[PDB]
């Protein structure tokens, strides 16, 4: 008919016990529309391309229509090539990359431009950029290039390659001058240990302005950085005060079906919100496919992934167009993808904390840039 009654959706998850899996299950359980999504979730090491491509080929031979999973720097090119060759959509909440196809929908919005706007707003000219090697170096190139145009002085420090003594020498060189400016671009699960390192042996107060380049400001424990003169400025994508996020979190709290793992609380992460909105865009795209009466059901079992005359299925372009032409309001706000498969037309709440509390200083858009408030 217009659409199959049950639609198989593949999934590549790094581990069984995670908050992202709980968000996936809850978002699947929330939907009650006639297009039902049957999940096939496989636990696969994301740092190995062989295991990931075996799982991808197994799910493709099973007959999935879209795959929701995570990747890394090692498996991004392989996933991009396979999705561009087999015309199979891949929806991911992982870090955005410049080298991608139109079949890869990255739910995580970019941050390499909001950070530059924030640095320009603060009139920073000499600072230390502490970055993570296994997170993508595009933002580091952008920072270095903007420094080249604007004659900045950036001291690039890698987290992996620097020991405690190197950090101590770097921070002594920082306290040699008066204005200590540090921009940290690293993930929360490592930024916690990084901030513990900063607060334990090093010190701050009356200066030491930090700009944390992350999508979640409430996801980290800033009590160690509190009660001091250090100023912390970050970015917030989701905040639980608006009507839709509060309603979603209230439905999550009073859930009749108990969630997996151990807990779903104690500083919930934004990646769970990205997973929730990924399930939501999948559901709305498939319901829009059913609404337009465009045939999606498979006419014959899918063959081997390694067929040399690999022809693309004709419904793949329709699936990609339906997944791309989506605009709804979810946990993270307005969800909308451009022609390149990345999120566009969104907002970030710029939040500053200077030994008083949490204060929103403005917001950044793709058109109005950083507007103060």
């Amino acid at each position: 008919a217009n659409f199959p009654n049950n639609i198989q959706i593949g999934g590549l998850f790094p581990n069984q016990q995670s908050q992202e899996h709980a968000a996936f299950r809850f978002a699947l359980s929330q939907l009650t529309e006639p297009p039902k999504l049957l999940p096939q979730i496989d636990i696969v090491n994301i740092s190995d391309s062989f295991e990931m491509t075996y799982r991808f080929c197994s799910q493709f031979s099973k007959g999935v229509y879209a795959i929701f999973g995570f990747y890394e720097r090692r498996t991004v090119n392989m996933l991009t090539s396979f999705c561009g060759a087999l015309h199979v959509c891949f929806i991911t909440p992982s870090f955005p990359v410049d080298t991608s196809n139109q079949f890869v929908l990255q739910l995580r919005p970019e941050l390499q431009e909001a950070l530059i706007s924030i640095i320009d707003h603060y009139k920073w000219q000499t600072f230390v950029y502490i970055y993570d090697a296994d997170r993508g170096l595009s933002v580091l190139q952008r920072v270095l290039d903007t420094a080249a145009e604007k004659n900045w002085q950036v001291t690039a420090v890698n987290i992996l390659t620097t020991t405690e003594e190197g950090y101590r020498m770097l921070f002594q060189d920082l306290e040699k001058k008066k204005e200590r400016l540090v921009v940290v671009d690293c993930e929360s699960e490592r930024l916690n240990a990084i901030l513990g390192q900063i607060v334990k042996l090093e010190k701050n107060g009356i200066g030491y302005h930090y700009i944390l380049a992350n999508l979640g400001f409430m996801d980290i424990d800033l009590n160690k950085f509190k009660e001091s003169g250090a100023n912390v400025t970050g970015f917030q994508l989701v905040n639980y005060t608006d009507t839709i996020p509060a309603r979603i979190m209230q439905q999550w709290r009073t859930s009749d079906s108990r969630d997996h793992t151990r807990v779903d609380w104690k500083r919930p992460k934004y990646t769970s919100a990205l997973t929730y909105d990924g399930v939501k865009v999948m559901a709305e795209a498939f319901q829009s496919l059913r609404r337009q009466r465009i045939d999606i059901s498979r006419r014959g079992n899918a063959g081997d992934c390694l067929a040399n005359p690999a022809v693309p299925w004709g419904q793949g372009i329709d699936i990609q167009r339906a997944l791309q032409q989506v605009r709804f309001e979810g946990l993270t706000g307005n969800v909308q993808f451009n022609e390149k498969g990345r999120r566009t037309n969104y907002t970030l709440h710029v939040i500053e904390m200077k030994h008083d509390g949490i204060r929103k200083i403005g917001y950044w858009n793709e058109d109005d840039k950083f507007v103060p408030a």
């Epitope: 209230q250 009073t254 997996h260 807990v263 609380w265 104690k266």
Partner: single-chain antibody, 229 residues
Framework: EVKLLESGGGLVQPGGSLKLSCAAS????????MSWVRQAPGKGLEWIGE????????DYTPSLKDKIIISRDNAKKTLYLQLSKVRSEDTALYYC????????????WGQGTSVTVNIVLTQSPASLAVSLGQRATISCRAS??????????VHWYQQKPGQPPKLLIF???KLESGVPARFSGSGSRTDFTLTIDPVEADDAATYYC?????????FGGGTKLEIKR
């Protein structure tokens, strides 16, 4: 660990409305929803009422829904339950408890008091008595599944007569916070088991196994534990 204060237990007139003051000190009901449970003397506990953290919609007991009404304020963190046509059997020990799903430390029930106006399981041995420092194991057989939605959905509450009950083991993966009890669920656990080692005088209480897998959370007969001298 949140604090719960419940005092004012006393007899009332025939059919007069009674109210219990349950104060959430050190926290608020918005973080964890407050639920009232009524337990008869020498019998398992029953869910008297479940409320919401945002104070939007509240529930009642599955046995007597319209007979009792509970109103709670999260900002004031105060809950009061009232009823009509109170009988001799209706005067049971009512205690308020915060939601245990938020954290292990959040599973702190109120003091509870008595007045004079589900889950099916069997815990063995019923009569247990060991010296201090010994290891005690109690097996709680149940007719339902040993684990709901993958992980375990059972818990053990160490209640005493006239004292606030405490949950030691919950879901076989998170023990009691603040004071880590040596007894916790482990393994596949077809029957709920918790190896207490070493034992202590302060660790002598009635352990009742309540399964959250079967709706609703009702305390079973449990097993009695003391300190043999």
């Amino acid at each position: 660990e949140v604090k719960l204060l419940e005092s004012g237990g006393g007899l009332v007139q025939p059919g007069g409305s009674l109210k219990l003051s349950c104060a959430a000190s050190g926290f608020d009901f918005s973080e964890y929803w407050m639920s009232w449970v009524r337990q008869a003397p020498g019998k398992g506990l029953e869910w008297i009422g479940e409320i919401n953290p945002d104070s939007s919609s509240i529930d009642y007991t599955p046995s007597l829904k319209d007979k009792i009404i509970i109103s709670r304020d999260n900002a004031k963190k105060t809950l009061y339950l009232q009823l009509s046509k109170v009988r001799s059997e209706d005067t049971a020990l009512y205690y308020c408890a915060r939601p245990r799903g938020n954290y292990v430390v959040m599973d702190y029930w109120g003091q509870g008091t008595s007045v004079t106006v589900n889950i099916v399981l069997t815990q063995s041995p019923a009569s247990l008595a060991v010296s201090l420092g010994q290891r005690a194991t109690i097996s709680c057989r149940a007719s339902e599944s040993v684990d709901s939605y993958g992980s375990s959905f059972v818990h053990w509450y160490q209640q005493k007569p006239g004292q606030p009950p405490k949950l030691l083991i919950f879901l076989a993966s998170k023990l009691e916070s603040g004071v880590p009890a040596r007894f916790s669920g482990s393994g596949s656990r077809t029957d709920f088991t918790l190896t207490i080692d070493p034992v202590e005088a302060d660790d002598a209480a009635t352990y009742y196994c309540q399964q959250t897998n079967e709706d609703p959370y009702t305390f079973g007969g449990g097993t009695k534990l003391e300190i043999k001298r």
